[PDB]
Amino acid sequence: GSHCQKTSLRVNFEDIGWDSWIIAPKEYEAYECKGGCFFPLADDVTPTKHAIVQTLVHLKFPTKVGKACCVPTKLSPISVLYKDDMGVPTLKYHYEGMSVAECGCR
């Protein structure tokens, strides 16, 4: 079974062009949600009714409707050292929505 779950994704800020304002860290663990949303479903996939219905419609009309998507359903913050307006290193202690805490089918 190849289902919806959290897997590693280490993100280098230089690589996405955010080194222009993030001094540190260089890299972080963002994680990614990977996996299929198909029947039979897993139990920590926490599907909405809509995701279930859509997956079923896709099974019957695959060319016309896509299947539900394995996505983050909860995110966590990281700390970033960034450059203030004046250019001063300023800590953002809780920089929200940066790392995957949980995945599910939506």
Q: Which does 63 bind (CB under 5 to 8 A by kind): Cl ion, Na ion, a second copy, none?
A: Na ion
CB contact at 8 A, 97 and 80: no
Which of Cl ion, Na ion, a second copy, none sits in contact with 56, Cβ below 5 to 8 A by type? Answer: a second copy
Q: How far is the CB of 18 from a second copy (least distance, A)?
A: 8
Residue choice 6, 41, 45, 99 for contact with a second copy (CB under 8 A):
99
Q: Which does 23 bind (CB under 5 to 8 A by kind): Cl ion, a second copy, Na ion, none?
A: none
81 interacts with a second copy by CB under 8 A: no
DSSP state of 3: B
* Cα gap 24→105, rounded to integer Å: 33
Q: How far is CA 54 from CA 1, 37, 64, 68, 78, in A?
A: 20, 10, 11, 6, 34
